[PDB]
Amino acid sequence: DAWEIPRESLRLEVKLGQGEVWMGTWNGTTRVAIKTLKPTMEAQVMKKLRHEKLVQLYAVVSEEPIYIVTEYMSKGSLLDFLKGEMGKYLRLPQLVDMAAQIASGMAYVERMNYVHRDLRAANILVGENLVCKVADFFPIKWTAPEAALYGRFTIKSDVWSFGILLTELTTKGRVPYPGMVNREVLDQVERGYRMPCPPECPESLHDLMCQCWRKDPEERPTFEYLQAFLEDYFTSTEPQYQPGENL
Ligand SMILES: C=CC(=O)N1CC[C@H](n2nc(C#Cc3cc(OC)cc(OC)c3)c3c(N)ncnc32)C1
């Protein structure tokens, strides 16, 4: 109830998505993102979870029409950012740094004993200075098989999805498993298949993806390990990295 805000304190300026979400002004002073719920149905979670790489809730209005006020992320979704005009310029150091920020946020989710259940670039927001924050808004291609088949949604299954998100980073937003329909992916991931090394992407990084894609959930690394691994990627793992045409 301390999060409650008067309806007149919000100005909805630019519509962004559609269950809409707007760019707006709160107290005529603050740039904010406003998500609208149409008069379906909440975010007790967002009031507890506070972390540098979790996008923060600012205020709420509880009675229909409901409005969720969160901080503004100037670059939109990471999927849009990677696919858009900035993709051409991102190289591995940039992409690995974003992946470390996401792992960092997810490691906070790991410490809090929460699960995301839907980690992928579409649910990562990007801000100024390549800041990336994980955000909570049929994703078989991103879902760990034991979660997709039996509903075991662990932080372990989120790790599997981080592994897939690393593929989105290194292909600059391309859908994983190119040319495979949903049923084709389920069947082949159980037969042991996994995405190959993306072009120009070091084998050290692809190996990290494979640790994320281990069939045994308890064998995949923690987010604490992933965060640390990516934060020193270019000193401990690829000290010889030389820029390329795309990575
Ligand atoms: C479906 C819309 C969608 O995916 N996007 C991505 C960009 C845009 N969007 N969407 C934003 C959002 C949001 C959001 C709204 C929420 O209300 C529960 C909860 C939540 O968990 C983090 C995130 C957003 C933002 N905060 N700042 C800038 N742009 C934002 C619309």
Swiss-Prot record:
Location of this chain's protein in the cell: Cell membrane; Mitochondrion inner membrane; Endosome membrane; Nucleus
Outcome (variant: C212A): Significant reduction in S-nitrosylation
UniProt: ATP binding residues: L16, G17, Q18, G19, E20, V21, K35
Residues with Phosphotyrosine modification: Y150, Y241
Chain positions with S-nitrosocysteine modification: C212
Expression (tissue specificity): Expressed to high levels, and with a high degree of kinase activity, in certain fully differentiated cells such as neurons, platelets and macrophages. Isoform 1 is widely expressed. Isoform 2 is expressed only in the muscle.
Post-translational note: Dephosphorylated at Tyr-241 by PTPRJ. Phosphorylated on Tyr-241 by c-Src kinase (CSK). The phosphorylated form is termed pp60c-src. S-nitrosylation is important for activation of its kinase activity.
Residue ranges of domain Protein kinase in the record: 10-234
Active site: D118
Assembly information from the UniProt record: Forms a complex with polyoma virus middle T antigen. Interacts with AFAP-110. Interacts with GJA1 and PXN.
Similarity comment: family membership: Belongs to the protein kinase superfamily. Tyr protein kinase family. SRC subfamily.
Protein's job: Non-receptor protein tyrosine kinase which is activated following engagement of many different classes of cellular receptors including immune response receptors, integrins and other adhesion receptors, receptor protein tyrosine kinases, G protein-coupled receptors as well as cytokine receptors. Participates in signaling pathways that control a diverse spectrum of biological activities including gene transcription, immune response, cell adhesion, cell cycle progression, apoptosis, migration, and transformation.
Name listed for the protein in its UniProt record: Proto-oncogene tyrosine-protein kinase Src
From-to range in the entire protein, with total length: 258 to 533 of 533
